[PDB]
Amino acid sequence: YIPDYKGMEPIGANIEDLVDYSKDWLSRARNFSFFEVKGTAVFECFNSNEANHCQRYPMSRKPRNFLLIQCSLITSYKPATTLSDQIDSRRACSYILNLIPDTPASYLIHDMAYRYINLTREDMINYYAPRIQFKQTQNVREPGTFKLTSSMLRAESKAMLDLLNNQIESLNIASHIVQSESVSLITKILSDLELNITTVLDKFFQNETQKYLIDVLKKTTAWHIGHLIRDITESLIAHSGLKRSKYWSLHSYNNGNVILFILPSKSLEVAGSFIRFITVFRIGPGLVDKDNLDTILIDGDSQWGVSKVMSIDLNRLLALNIAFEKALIATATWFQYYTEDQGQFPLQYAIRSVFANHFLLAICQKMKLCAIFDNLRYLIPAVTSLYSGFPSLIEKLFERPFKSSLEVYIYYNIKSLLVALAQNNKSGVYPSFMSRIVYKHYRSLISEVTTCFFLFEKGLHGNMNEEAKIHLETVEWALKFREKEEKYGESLVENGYMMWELRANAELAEQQLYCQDAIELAAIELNKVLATKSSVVANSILSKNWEEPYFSQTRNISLKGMSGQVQEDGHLSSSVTIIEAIRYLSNSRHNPSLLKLYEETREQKAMARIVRKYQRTEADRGFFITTLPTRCRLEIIEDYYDAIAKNISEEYISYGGEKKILAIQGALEKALRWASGESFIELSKFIRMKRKLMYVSADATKWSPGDNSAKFRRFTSMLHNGLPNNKLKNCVIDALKQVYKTDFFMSRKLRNYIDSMESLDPHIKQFLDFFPDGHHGEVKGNWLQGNLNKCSSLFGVAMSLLFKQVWTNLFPELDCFFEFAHHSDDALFIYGYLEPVDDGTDWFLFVSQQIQAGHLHWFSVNTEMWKSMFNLHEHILLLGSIKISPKKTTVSPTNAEFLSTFFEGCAVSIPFVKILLGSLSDLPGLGYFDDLAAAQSRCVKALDLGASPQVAQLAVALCTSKVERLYGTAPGMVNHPAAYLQVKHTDTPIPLGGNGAMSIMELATAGIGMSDKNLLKRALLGYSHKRQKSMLYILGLFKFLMKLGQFSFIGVQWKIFTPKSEFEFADMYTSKFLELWSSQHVTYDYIIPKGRDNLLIYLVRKLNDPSIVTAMTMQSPLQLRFRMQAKQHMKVCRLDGEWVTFREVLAAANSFAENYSATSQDMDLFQTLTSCTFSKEYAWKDFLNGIHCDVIPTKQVQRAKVARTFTAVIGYKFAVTVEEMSDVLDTARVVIVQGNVEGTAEAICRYWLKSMSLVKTIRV
RNA sequence: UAGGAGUAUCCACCGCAAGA
RNA sequence: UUUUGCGGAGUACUACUA
Ligand SMILES: [Mg+2]
Fold this sequence. Notes:
This is RNA-directed RNA polymerase L. The structure is a monomer. The chain is an alpha+beta fold. Among the domains are: 15-26 and 466-550 and 592-879, no CATH class; 71-166 and 173-313, no CATH class; 914-1055 and 1140-1185, no CATH class; 1187-1207 and 1229-1260, no CATH class. It is built from 50 helices and 32 strands. The strands form 10 sheets. Strands 1, 12, 19, 20, 23, 24 and 25 form a 7-stranded antiparallel sheet that branches. Strands 5, 6, 7, 9, 10 and 11 form a 6-stranded antiparallel sheet that branches. Strands 18-17-21-22 form a 4-stranded mixed sheet. A hairpin with a 5-residue loop joins strand 15 and strand 16 (572-576). The protein is globular and about 105 Å long. 45% of the residues are buried. Bound molecules: magnesium ion. Residues 697, 699, 826, 897-898 line the site of magnesium ion. It binds 2 RNA strands through helix 6, strand 11, helix 18, strand 17 and strand 18.
């Protein structure tokens, strides 16, 4: 119970010592860490890097492939149908056999066509046929495949087969020939993609967006090529199954114009697999790269271009499947941004070229382009801002090799764009990256380069090259810490250097080293604010689970991964958190408290493993999987520092995930309020000075790696709380002491890769030297990333306040404003300075007099006071292990960025493409209702974040169509409700299918399942008006669902991810024991037991619950997407605990609802269910239907945007035993709107209705 | 090099029977 | 290193906050 700990004793250093040190520091000429942006400077950087690039990578004469799928279209494309497929295949094979092969790929294509066209009739009846109507015919062993034996191949075909089944260089970007060729080729590709092929919601949609965006895009070749590529990717997905990838296959599209030959390949349901295919197409306008075509066969007034043997992974294939939809979403978002910026609808040519560019980017899913765009998204803020570290960003840009031809075009475009942006510094002009039109607001530009960036999927890195990269950042900084320990001394590095040591050395102010006096002073300045709210601090600290038993919280028993025990091999075993909780409970006598658990697990060493986050950035970041004692320590420290963090301002990680924007906008508004007026400074009779603001959007170089975790200890020893005795503080200090050293474990993938290396070249031996035994190494000082995320931000705020106090002491005469926002490494600093008026000759005289008086430090305030302010702030932050990165820090007079949001004065620009495009590339997979809700719920989030209602409606339509195609619910597919349900496909329960297309306003206000609920109401109304059999029929379906993600009446699994093995402790108790015990203790399904035996039984039951079990197995997203698209035709419905097709569930529902009769209990339950629970949602739709809209003549000039807000005992009810009594007793939406819109719950809906038209204002 | 990735050597399938 | 006949091959995912 809180063991006695030695704690720490204050050093008692004075603030005046730091003031004297700062005076000495500022009495000298200090170089600036940033470079002012100029067109000449950017041009010089580009020229020098271009000249020096050729010496780094070997020169290459052959630009490499950049198109994953090459296909050309000349006529309108219709969706593929099985009959529209057989005839196309016949004509296509006739055309191919007419041709003459040239290359081995052409020989393989010819052999495939000759084999296909000579298949007998019986196979082709079995071909193109479903599973039920399919039989093996000695030539077709799967519904859509055919066998091609090696004996049925020519010499060149088997040579190509042997090639398939049997140093980095960069293009000379400095040359003008390479740039000219790349630009000429990609301009031609874009031009061919741009060619033309020979209620209130719907009213406004058709008037504004459909007429000006969709109607324009319906005729472009990019639209129909995207449809064709969707068809090709669907054919590849169907063929890539676990039983169809063995054999070959031929498909045809566009009247035999595009022919897809799928070769045998590893099935995509296995890791490290590629789908291998060829595509033959008549040469014409389209996505044709003639240089990288394998062959161009020639016939009479015909050119058939045969592409190379492409190998596409599952991620790129699924990206290409949704390429057209992603391009359309991106184009609609631009369209909205252009309308907001220029106030008029974009012209035809611009809206066609933008769509072509977005589609081309969506098709070319390559990592090099993703890295280039990731660098560009940081380069653009650098050149626009007044001061930034743009030379470092340009060097990183030039780091990569430009092997492809698309990368050279993108590089040329970004070079021209950056030179133009820098030349127009000092409502400005901002040229568009894809279009010729210029912009009036910077938010529009950084939002076309963000939307362009987000078209690339997550996880395009190498599966083994990037596994070794994530360890390097940790190992290199651990080695640097070891070097500092050996050089300066272990005691000095861990404890910290005194002020006099820094003064004598003047080199100790480095990363991974902290100054004891600085830490104490920062803690004192934080206590200066904590003294007022000491009572609240004590209350919040005691509100933390200090005495509540462990493993009774959601965090301590969850599905999150956790390091297990060191295996016999030596690697750190990976396991579920709940598994480790069950183990510990089984190996313990009683459920322990947090502090008791810390007492038992204090001696054990912290251990961790690093695993990829699968990001879309240039370099993948890794997150650390920590073991159980490490989790306990980190929980103690994070709870103690989260209690304090919530009680002070300028701390933004402690705030909510939605309140951050509100708080930062309030801070910016306060800063702007200070800017009003003028400051009078005493001559000692006043001088007038103009108040000016400067925003520094900062980002620390290294937060986790380049840090010393010991600096918190002394900090914790000085932070003042309202607790009577410093016992909890001592416990937290001890926990910080025990987390100093960590056993960083190399991943299994990396150790196998290094074991199979066979030649340990340099830069790998040095990395392997960190692990002495070859499996783990000691990391000191570094607290693993993610952990301690609130303590670090609190420390940063403390250091910022220390700098503020130091600056106030240094220059008492001047009045300056300081606003700080610290969200972990991300930070924003608003400094205020007094610029003199009329040349400030009196100000210069005052400065000269001050220097003559004896103040040698005033040499840093005569001109550009903000430079001195930032220099002192950076140095004082460097007294701790906080270095502000010269690379990704921007100094601007007007614009700013914080938390990946852009601020122009008080205006905030939340990107919503991250949300819209995210609604299309993933799915929970729990069920059709649970997928539709997830797809629609994201589009509501975008609508809150600033998406226009028309763009949100279009994205909703695209997501609904994609979901319907995925599960087959769409009309004309296998799982169409209308065929087996005696309905119009509109009055079908949502869990069973039916039209999920809803008004965006209905989802925004009423809810996501609203239509389903509406159905019930309508049905009930029928049964209360006409006693119609149809309504009674709908009533039977709802009862059927209840007898058989959001919480409602849903029809129990559609997810198929069942485990391949039983878990470690799933069989601890027999099923009879759990079945009896669940009935004996009814409440335990609502609250978590606090007794070991009861908690152990509850956890074991949680291990045997199918709902929990299926969630553990699902670890890799989009594999459910692939499996659903491959097998919507059969194998899954969860009918009476049996895996059958969904059609049988539809038939069973039909039978049940046909043999269903109305009873008093069910009807009364339905009447209560519809009236009571939905009493608020029905009113929401009634308000929507009780509204009217009319357009008044006035163009919509958007104003500044703001952020607003949208506005236990059950265990007692069934409680029986005294232990249950104790258990229950112990247990007990931000939106972006305009300026004029208030925070009323209905005013936001009124604004959403008002913003229906992007150009013409309307009145509600 | 036919593709993905890369100035980290990777992925691009696994077994049996029978014949050479 | 190959040919034929068979059978198969379900993807490690942290604390953080509404
Ligand atoms: Mg930032």
